[PDB]
Design an enzyme around this catalytic site. Structure first.
Site, mmCIF file in Angstrom:
data_model
loop_
_atom_site.group_PDB
_atom_site.id
_atom_site.type_symbol
_atom_site.label_atom_id
_atom_site.label_comp_id
_atom_site.label_asym_id
_atom_site.label_seq_id
_atom_site.Cartn_x
_atom_site.Cartn_y
_atom_site.Cartn_z
ATOM 1 N N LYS A 111 19.382 74.651 66.370
ATOM 2 C CA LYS A 111 19.174 76.080 66.540
ATOM 3 C C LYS A 111 19.784 76.534 67.872
ATOM 4 C CE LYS A 111 15.509 79.566 67.005
ATOM 5 N NZ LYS A 111 14.197 79.956 66.360
ATOM 6 N N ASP A 150 5.621 87.331 66.055
ATOM 7 C CA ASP A 150 6.659 87.849 65.173
ATOM 8 C C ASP A 150 6.625 87.113 63.851
ATOM 9 O OD1 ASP A 150 8.490 89.845 64.786
ATOM 10 O OD2 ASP A 150 10.145 88.814 65.804
#
Length: 331
Positions: A115, A218
Site C-alpha cells: 500500500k 472512516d
C-alpha cells in the site's frame, strides 16, 4: 501511475545517488549537485533524471535536484527488495483517491499487498493525476510517511490484540507491505443470508475498538472486507466475518471530536445496512456517551498509545491529523 520498469536497470551507484538525493532533501527540497556528492555520480544523476526518479529545478535563485514521487516509490521498493519482503511486482494495481495498491510477491512465491500513501493527490478534468500545490513535494512525502508509520503501528497493535485486520509485514517511507486477505470489499457484496448477525459483528468491532481506545473514523464500505467461509459440516452453510482496513485516520476516544467520529462510524454502518440490504437495527445506538465508559476497562490495552510508542512527536501527530481531516473534508 507507478511505472516500475527501470527498477532492475539501476546500478548500485544509482541506488546510492538516489538515496543521497533523498537524504539531501531532509533539509533542503532542491538539492544542489555538490551536496549529492558529499552524501563521479554525474552519470547517476543523468540516469535517475531520465527515469523520472529525480527532477532538476533551475528556477532563478535555486538550482539542483528534487526527489520525485517515483523516486520515493523506487527507494521504498528497493528497501523492500533488499529485505526480501518483496521479490516481484504484480501487473494488477489499485489507484485510490488517497492511496495506491500493488500486488507483490516474495521469493517463495507468497503474494502480499503493497500500500502506497498518496496524500495530496488530486485529479484534473478538462473543461473544453497531480498533487495539490498548496504544499511542497517534500511536505506531501513527509505527510505520506507519517500516514504509513501510523497505519502500520496501529495495524501491529490491532493484529496483536486479535482484531480482524491484515498482517502488517513491513513498512518503509510512505509504504506498507501487509498480508493479502481473501475477502472482498462489502460494497461489492450483493446480499447476505443473515444481515442481523453481520451487523451485530460490525457493531461489536466498533465497541471493541472503543474499549481499546480507538475510533476508526472512516468506516466506509471499501474499508470493511467480508470473508466467506463455506462450512464443512454442510457446504450450504455460509458464515461471513468482517475484516477492517485503513488505519492512518484512526483517532483516540480521547479526541476532542471523538463523539462525532464515533457516532458517524455507527451511523455510516446503519446507513449502509439500510440501503444495501434493506436491514435496519431495532437496537438503538450504540452511543458514544456509553462507549466512552468502556475505555479502557477490564484490562483492555489502550492501543491508541501505539503512536507515542513509535517516536511520533505531538507535532507529527497534529501535522498528520490536519492533512487527513483536510483530505476527508474535500472529497
Amino acid at each position: 501511475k507507478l511505472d516500475t520498469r527501470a527498477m532492475r536497470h539501476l546500478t548500485a551507484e544509482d541506488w546510492r545517488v538516489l538515496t543521497a538525493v533523498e537524504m539531501g532533501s531532509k533539509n533542503h527540497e532542491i538539492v544542489p549537485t555538490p551536496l549529492i556528492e558529499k552524501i563521479g555520480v554525474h552519470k547517476s544523476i543523468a540516469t535517475l533524471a531520465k527515469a523520472g526518479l529525480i527532477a532538476r529545478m533551475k528556477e532563478a535563485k535555486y538550482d539542483g535536484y528534487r526527489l520525485t514521487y517515483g523516486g520515493l516509490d523506487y527507494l521504498a521498493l528497493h528497501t523492500h527488495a533488499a529485505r526480501k519482503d518483496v521479490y516481484s511486482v504484480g501487473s494488477r494495481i489499485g489507484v485510490g483517491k488517497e492511496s495506491d495498491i500493488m500486488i507483490v510477491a516474495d521469493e517463495k512465491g507468497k503474494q502480499k499487498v503493497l500500500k502506497i500513501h498518496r496524500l495530496g493527490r488530486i485529479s484534473f478534468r478538462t473543461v473544453k493525476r497531480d498533487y495539490l500545490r498548496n504544499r511542497s513535494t517534500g511536505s506531501w512525502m513527509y505527510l505520506s510517511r507519517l500516514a504509513a508509520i501510523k497505519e502500520f503501528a496501529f495495524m501491529k497493535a490491532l493484529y496483536e490484540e486479535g482484531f480482524p485486520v491484515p498482517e502488517p509485514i513491513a513498512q518503509s517511507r510512505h509504504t506498507i507491505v501487509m498480508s493479502l486477505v481473501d475477502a472482498l470489499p462489502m460494497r461489492q457484496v450483493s446480499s447476505v443470508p443473515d444481515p442481523a448477525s453481520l451487523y451485530a459483528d460490525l457493531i461489536a468491532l466498533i465497541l471493541r475498538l472503543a474499549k481499546h481506545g480507538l475510533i476508526h473514523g472512516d468506516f466506509n464500505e471499501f474499508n470493511i472486507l467480508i470473508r466467506e467461509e463455506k462450512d464443512a459440516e454442510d457446504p450450504s452453510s455460509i458464515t461471513l466475518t468482517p475484516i477492517i482496513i485503513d488505519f492512518p485516520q484512526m483517532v483516540s476516544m480521547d479526541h476532542p471530536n471523538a463523539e462525532m467520529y464515533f457516532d458517524r462510524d455507527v451511523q455510516c454502518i446503519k446507513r449502509f445496512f439500510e440501503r444495501r440490504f434493506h436491514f435496519v437495527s431495532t437496537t438503538p445506538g450504540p452511543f458514544y456517551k456509553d462507549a466512552k465508559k468502556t475505555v479502557g476497562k477490564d484490562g483492555a490495552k489502550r492501543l491508541d498509545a501505539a503512536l507515542e510508542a513509535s517516536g511520533f512527536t505531538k507535532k507529527m501527530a497534529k501535522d498528520l491529523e490536519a492533512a487527513i481531516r483536510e483530505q476527508q473534508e474535500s472529497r
